[PDB]
């Protein structure tokens, strides 16, 4: 099952697309629906015609419906350095200490209102000359840490603020339009091997590909199960929480995002998340 959400006349509607391309309108809140699917693979709803899923992915708005975040995730967290100048402890840089350490990096990323979806604009802080989109795979957790599904997440980060001081990391991570995900949430059974997925980032600037990298999730060293273990340790999380797993694609200092740029991220079996950029004014 792949789960998406639109806004129609000011209220939300959740739809599910099945492998046979039949679309179902959910009777339930989508978080509770993912929890139900997790138990018995059942979607409560009715089969609907006239929902143009493909046009929503390509055009965002069709008829009176516009695609958005697939859910409101009460909390969003992130893990850093899960894949293969700055501060440092005893010569060893703090980032490469984490890469070897038993304890991984876990940080708070967003609340639902700080997030955006397919077609909606991510944001660059007003006080940032070097903001980068971090293309990552993310998971939707229940309160026990069980994976309910996967989605594409964009951990937008003001890399210059982090670089100045690791104590600025929250400021570099947590702000309006600092997080994007979708276009859908795929249920767990849609992904057989999470550690064999391609992730392609593209940054379009004036109809022209300013950057393009990609990496497979087989390059991931820190396992997702372990990231969750540390997240929920003495730390109750609400159902529908999202954990973003980390990025490998990191454009250079000179590849900072700017107003009007289009960030396109593609992950295998999930889809392609497209978002414009909005530079904030002081």
């Amino acid at each position: 099952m792949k789960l998406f959400r639109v806004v129609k006349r000011g209220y939300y509607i959740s739809y599910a697309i099945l492998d046979n391309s039949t679309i179902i309108r959910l009777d339930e809140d989508p978080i509770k629906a993912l929890m139900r699917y997790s138990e018995n693979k059942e979607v409560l709803g009715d089969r609907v015609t006239g929902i143009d899923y493909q046009s929503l992915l390509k055009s965002f708005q069709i008829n009176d419906i516009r695609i958005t975040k697939p859910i409101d995730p009460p909390e969003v967290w992130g893990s850093g350095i899960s894949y293969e100048n700055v501060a440092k402890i005893l010569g060893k840089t703090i980032y490469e200490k984490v890469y070897d350490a038993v304890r991984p990096e876990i940080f708070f990323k967003a609340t639902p209102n700080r997030c955006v979806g397919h077609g909606e604009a991510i944001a660059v802080r007003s006080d940032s000359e070097w903001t980068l989109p971090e293309p990552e795979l993310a998971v939707v957790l229940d309160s026990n840490g069980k994976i309910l599904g996967y989605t594409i997440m964009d951990d937008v980060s003001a890399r210059d603020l982090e670089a100045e001081n690791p104590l600025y990391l929250p400021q570099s991570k947590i702000y309006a339009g600092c997080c994007a995900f979708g276009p859908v949430i795929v249920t767990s059974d849609e992904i057989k091997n999470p550690y064999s997925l391609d992730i392609t980032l593209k940054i379009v600037r004036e109809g022209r590909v300013f950057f393009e990298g990609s990496v497979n999730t087989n390059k991931m060293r820190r396992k997702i199960e372990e990231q969750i273990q540390y997240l929920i340790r003495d730390n109750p999380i609400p159902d529908g929480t999202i954990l973003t797993t980390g990025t490998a694609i990191v454009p250079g200092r000179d590849k900072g995002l700017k107003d009007e740029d289009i960030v396109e991220i593609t992950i295998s079996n999930i889809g392609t998340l497209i978002t414009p950029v909005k530079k904030r004014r002081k």
Copy 2:
């Protein structure tokens, strides 16, 4: 107006105690009341008798009511290094860089469910051998950054985890029972000079005063308005958001909290917050 809340048989009731020992029971949600009082110093409610506010401060529970968090703050943030081995950037340590730098340390600290109050227990993480209570003055804010009131907050920190790597700061700060505040929220008018208050931390182990030490808020070199300025830059905060301003009282390596302790924090014009300590186990 000094504002507190109780829990009675599964529901909350908010009371505002006024300059004169006359207690008023609120018609409104307590966060909204603070916004109204900030506007015109009006309070909606009936003058109540038979509410032993002083017995609640000492005993926590009287009859069928018990004191708790005065409000549910949708968000809690913190600001470190506001008053006068570890990592470093070009020799100079990360902490003493933030002190000198124009930008302060702002970090996400808590959500309502992770917060506790007078009489309720704060938590030491299962995997922390050195966790300290950081006594601080905290401000309740509206979404514009207007100081709706002051309170005593305990920013409970797993200092060992912080010391290992600054990137473990979120994990050291954000967990169940990592944050306590109360026993009241005082309105802006109750405090003439916020930089003229006596913060005192006491820790009681087995009836004996295991630690003591106080400081005045005149020693605070980072001004709260600056902290609020950076907190909200490009960062929409909800009404009732709490910003804890930083600590000056820092016990040593041998003075780490453990099960059954009693952490008492006093601030001038606000009162004394008392929370027993609870150790989490693996």
Copy 3:
């Protein structure tokens, strides 16, 4: 548009079958949707498939969905003695009367018609759900009637079939027992759908048919056309709403003409089918109440 409603896992879903047999699932409260449609003929919702409406009519239930009252009408009122009936010259020596003329035939000629309160939503049942005979009635009859769904201004939002189940023996004993005879658990039934106003060009040209079935055998049958109605619906509404504000989705049942005999009283296990032209067939089993 014809409006129906199902229950599914303890919650309601409303559906609107359009004229080209396309089924739409309402995003709105059905009463809200009736009012919308009344203004501009629009229905908010997605076209759906797999909703086997014709099966819900015949079988009542399919998998986890079951048909019920098409709406919760906040109030239900009725208007008796609205059809043509000849001055039958020997009034039963027992009906209440005023200066010799029976109360029922005084209403017949009066300017003021009979208007009475019939039910709340929780006293109403739908297609496939059981109507009741009171535990203390030995002559309860179904009264097949055309009913209209009203807004607060008295505007007709649509029509449906209504069964005004009446403990006629209690009404016979004393007209002051009328409320006890009309108002009780399962005393009222409507559906299977609410058809919008435009689905009925002439409301005074519909065939109403009643069938009572006992153990497969057809116990009673009769019919009547609404061209026989004398007390017109516009008048019934005028008197209903006079100094008496009604909520949106109120239903006014407009009276019956099919009256089974004294020997044809309802009893347990019976089935009651009512058919009206352009609306459908309402079917309800009967339940006798135990003391």
Copy 4:
């Protein structure tokens, strides 16, 4: 306990005044509170001061609080002829048939929105030339028929219509402002004998007593418990349903209500209900 309700700034607040003058503000819905009191006589709430109950009875609106119906009864039913030209069955009149018969008159009277309270206007229908107030005792019921308390009720009746035809009875009983009750609901224990109570009806036209009359509830022949039995027979009623038990006081043909009149009704241990009279236009 004696239970009343005000409207303050658009919302409702219910208060309980105990015999010893002490006024309690309720935590629960008043209907639920009455069911709790019926159980074990426990009342959840706080004692309050500054609520002048006696002045509210006399002034209706004090400052920004205004007394109204003590509860919203989901249903109101009536019962005629419980005490000592027209239609008739076998020469004998329909009313005295009911008086003797084992089955009493039970009829539906009002929905909550058709009811009014102390200080609010009852109505005379536009098409009625002889409307009389019927002062009656009334009981508040739970769904099992158990009496939760007593109150004054005015069954405002368009008598000319009832006279023309008893099939017009519902039109004479059910319309906007056809019912009034309060100012309080007294709990069951506040009345030791309901069959020994003085009911008094004053009507005030242009300064003067236009009608006065009274009668005790010892003249009531139809017992209340019987009326409740027939009400709930095969006929479930919601919690908070009111049953009014018929009137003994009946003014004559000349004493029909009209615009600007005032209706006072008094019953021992309950209080006095006052309502202006509005005549509807065409």
